[PDB]
Amino acid sequence: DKVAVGKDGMVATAHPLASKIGAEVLKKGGNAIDAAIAIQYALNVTEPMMSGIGGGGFMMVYDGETKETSIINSRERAPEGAKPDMFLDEDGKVIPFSERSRHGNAVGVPGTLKGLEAAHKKWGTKKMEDLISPSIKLTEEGFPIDSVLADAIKDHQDKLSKTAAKDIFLPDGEPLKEGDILVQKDMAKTFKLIRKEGSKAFYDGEIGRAIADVVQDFGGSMTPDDLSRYEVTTDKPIWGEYHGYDIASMPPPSSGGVFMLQMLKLIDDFHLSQYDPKSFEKYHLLAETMHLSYADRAAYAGDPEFVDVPLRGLLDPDYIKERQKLISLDSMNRDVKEGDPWKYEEGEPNYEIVPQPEDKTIGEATHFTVTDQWGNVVSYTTTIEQLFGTGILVPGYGLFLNNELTDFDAIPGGANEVQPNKRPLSSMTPTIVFKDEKPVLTVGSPGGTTIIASVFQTILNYFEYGMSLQDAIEEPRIYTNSLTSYRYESGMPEDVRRKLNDFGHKFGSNPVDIGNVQSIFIDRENKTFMGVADSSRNGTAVGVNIKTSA
Ligand code: NA
């Protein structure tokens, strides 16, 4: 079911099998981290277009013992053979996203598996053999697919029809429909090999060199030395405060936390509870806020190891006011340029503001969350950049490679320019909300740049409007990053949309799904966990109740 309640454990994932697997891990004494790993593998199996060991993600973990919140950063790095103008042709103009998404240089160094390694060596309590076996037997013996997978295959037949993925997903040229069984023998082989040799086989073994060869064959410049040079990082979350709660989220190289918190700070003083959850005022103010935030994102966000992001000025109260001057109910801001936070901050941008064309299909990830009986809290957002990533299947291994490096700017000079060993700017937002410095909520969503809007709104809907968790998730969302791009979910009143367009907005004719939030609420005063999965997909929440003497 989409909503469940537990007392000793709780799991919320995008695929039911992964949910029941993680729940099983919790059931026989495992913790939230073990479950997180098992769920990662199960998601690799059942939803290979969203997450994988050929991709990367951000894993937020709240430790039950040390009471510390840390982040396993497994973002992909560019090879040192990667160049700033590698997204430009010989004529100095931007290669279309359709070709960029599938090319060799779009592939970054996969970091997921090493992230799982670090997580297992820090908080792991069960043998990873046990954690990977169910996924192995899920790829070996097959499984009946869901509607999301089938629709994804049918919508991306063309990308899959040029790689080693056809003979698996397009048997005779026909995509596997809902109910069809998906068998992945080669994937099972890779999982078994990893079960044998560990991460060694991936980063210093046959799998690595194979990935290298197929990448170079697709025009890439990645070497096995690039793989063997890779290490995950550990990040301290970015902190904000909203209506008495402390919010912990993802800092650079992700843009999620900073500007989600910025949107919160910007819209807080308008008190949206004053208006109706489907009124003109709320939607309008949301849009006006998002424009400013994304405007800043397009100019000030990038890998902190390479460029300086002005966090301190992006969240400064006086700066927030200065930007709030541009937000009003009586008019619409038609000149949406990035603000100047550097006033309120020591330092100077070591780059320039470089305009980018908006040729970006927006990609989808997967987010999941786990909670155990020891106060450990896991909120993991993992991704290959887009559905099936590049589409490139590692030959003989049945593994999809990401196109994460497209998250870089096509035109160099900016903070998010292509640099070697540099991590591309992400929009993912794994987030944990605390009260009295103790975890009470988990928020996270997939869908590239829209994620920030999905989380924000959700959080808003939960605290400003005080709605229930499922109501906060299911409450229709909107998205806009410019005066040209607008999206709205099914649920917005037609007259309100029409008036919004009369005010200068550009909402389209038909609605689309925005994000997919899985969340876990921690009710300590009732000693239970509540799990909710978004209806946008076939997500699932499963609770765990363990008897004493067990
Ligand atoms: Na992304």
TrEMBL record:
UniProt: Mg(2+) binding residues: 243
- What organism is recorded for this protein? Bacillus licheniformis
- Pathway the protein contributes to: Sulfur metabolism; glutathione metabolism
| Enzyme Commission number, as recorded | 2.3.2.2, 3.4.19.13
Catalyses which reaction(s): an S-substituted glutathione + H2O = an S-substituted L-cysteinylglycine + L-glutamate; glutathione + H2O = L-cysteinylglycine + L-glutamate; an N-terminal (5-L-glutamyl)-[peptide] + an alpha-amino acid = 5-L-glutamyl amino acid + an N-terminal L-alpha-aminoacyl-[peptide]
According to the record, which residues of the full protein are present here? 35 to 398 of 585
Native organism taxonomy: Bacteria, Bacillati, Bacillota, Bacilli, Bacillales
* Record protein name field: Glutathione hydrolase proenzyme
Under the subunit heading, UniProt states: This enzyme consists of two polypeptide chains, which are synthesized in precursor form from a single polypeptide.
**GO biological-process terms attached to the record:** glutathione biosynthetic process; glutathione catabolic process
